[PDB]
């Protein structure tokens, strides 16, 4: 019986960022209806608010995978906040045109306004323009009227970075800021898929970065500790995983069973 969730409907993904946590282990995606029939399940059980991820959510179907299930987490279920996490790469503006209206939230990660630790960090596909493409989608979200936040990962390659006045400019509703990440067998392991030991940083760095920060009202830390103790997963299976052997999928043994394994 939760209230909010994230949904990595995917693993599928466009990028290849170095310290990514969750990886392309796997190709699978849920049929729509199946997919439809968990979230009724979660409606059901007292879900409030959806978190679309993966993976690029955009990728299955050229977004209209995701549009789908966006729209039918609004317009059906009545869940009054719907989110999207995106790498922002492969969203067009005729998605907005046919999704928009049912989206509450739109966050891109960025992790640096630095075009060459973009690209070092693995966050991008070659064009190296992936700063330049954020304020474009700045614009789509005012002008479609969806609620644009940047999350950012701090890691080695920018936590001495000074992103104030970028950040700033971009005015966006929310800035959440993430310590990188380690989980065992995702980005961890020497059969693991990405080993971001060497992005990781000390809880005293990443409270130099917010410190350095504390000026951007709207910025909000998401800590190792905070993101072990409060970040739940639902698979691309729809099992429940933490960040700390999956679940039972709820679309075999319901909510409440599943919840109870993670
Ligand atoms: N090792 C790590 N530690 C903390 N956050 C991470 C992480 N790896 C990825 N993330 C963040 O987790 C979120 C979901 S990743 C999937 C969403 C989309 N592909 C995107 O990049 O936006 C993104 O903000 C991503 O940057
Ligand atoms: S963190 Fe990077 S590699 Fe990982 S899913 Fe998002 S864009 Fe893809």
Redesign the pocket.
């Known amino acids: 019986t939760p209230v909010s969730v994230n949904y990595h409907f995917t693993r599928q ?5 170095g ?5 392309a282990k796997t190709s699978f995606v849920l049929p729509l209806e199946e997919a439809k029939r968990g979230l009724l399940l979660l409606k059901q059980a007292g879900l409030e608010k959806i978190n679309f991820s ?3 959510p955009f990728l299955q179907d050229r977004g209209e995978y995701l549009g789908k299930l966006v729209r039918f987490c609004k317009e059906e279920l009545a869940l009054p906040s719907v989110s999207i996490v995106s ?1 922002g790469s492969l969203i067009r503006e005729r998605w907005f045109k046919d999704y928009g209206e049912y989206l509450d939230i739109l966050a891109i ?1 960025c992790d640096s306004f630095d075009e060459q630790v973009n690209a070092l960090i ?2 991008g596909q070659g064009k190296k323009n992936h700063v330049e493409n954020l304020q474009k989608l700045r614009r789509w979200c005012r002008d479609y009227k969806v609620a644009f936040k940047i999350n950012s ?1 701090i890691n080695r390659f920018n936590v001495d970075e000074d992103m104030n006045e970028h950040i700033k400019a971009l005015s966006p509703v929310r800035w959440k800021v993430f310590q990188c990440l380690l989980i065992e067998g995702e980005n961890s392991g020497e059969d693991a898929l990405r080993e971001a030991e060497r992005f990781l940083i000390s809880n005293e760095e990443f409270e130099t970065f917010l410190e350095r920060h504390k000026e951007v009202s709207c910025l909000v830390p998401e800590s190792n500790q905070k993101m072990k103790d409060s970040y739940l997963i639902l698979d691309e299976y729809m099992r429940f995983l933490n960040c700390t052997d999956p679940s039972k999928s709820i679309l075999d043994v319901g909510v409440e069973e599943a919840i109870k394994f993670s």
């Open positions: 993904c466009n990028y290849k960022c310290f990514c946590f969750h990886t993966g993976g690029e790498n990660s693995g966050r990962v």
